[model samples]
Target: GSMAWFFGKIPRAKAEEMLSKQRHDGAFLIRESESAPGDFSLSVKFGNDVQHFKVLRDGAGKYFLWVVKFNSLNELVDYHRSTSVSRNQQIFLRDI
Candidate 1:
């Protein structure tokens, strides 16, 4: 429920900004994973013009988050924008 609520309220511009900054920096911490039960550490990074995304876990394990350039971040932004549009439509529909 909380995750749904969080996703429902996500802002597209903010998400886009975040993705842009992350893309520019090519690295970011997975803070959510840090709070998990086990002593695990995981991070996601985009490298070489987003040529690859990497996922690092535990102490030694590492893998690519995505081998190919995928716009999941953009999809997230689009989803939030679409949700906003849908919410507006519902409001107008109720008025009519």
Candidate 2:
């Protein structure tokens, strides 16, 4: 991926704190697990199912936490396909 595709990271402690706040708010169910040495996996509830994504530490040594919202799965898929492949742009939380 290109540098333009990256979102600046936050400290690991800060990321965990933010995630804790979200969990406490009852926004959605979340779980974190180790994916690799420096990578992490996040499982979040989406509707009745769960979706998983990866979180990586940025070059500056912080973990990134993102929040993405979509009205429907189709909408999310459409946006991902359009922006990612066609336009050569990554889907960022700010974009949604």
lDDT per residue as tens, model 1, 6-66: 2222233443344445644545332222233432222333553322222444346554343
Considering summed lDDT, which 10 consecutive residues are worst modelled in model 2?
A: 23-32
Cα displacement (angstroms), candidate 2, residue 34, comes to 4.8
Per-prediction TM-score: 0.21, 0.32
**Superposition TM-score, candidate 1 onto the true structure:** 0.21
Best by TM-score: 2
Candidate 1 stretches with Cα past 4 Å from truth are 1-20, 32-36, 47-96
Off by over 4 Å in 2: 1-35, 65-96
Name the lDDT value of residue 32 in candidate 2: 42
TM-score of 2: 0.32
What are the root-mean-square deviations of the candidates from the true structure over C-alphas? 17.5, 13.0
Query: What overall lDDT goes with each candidate model?
Result: 0.37, 0.49
| lDDT computed for candidate 1 | 0.37
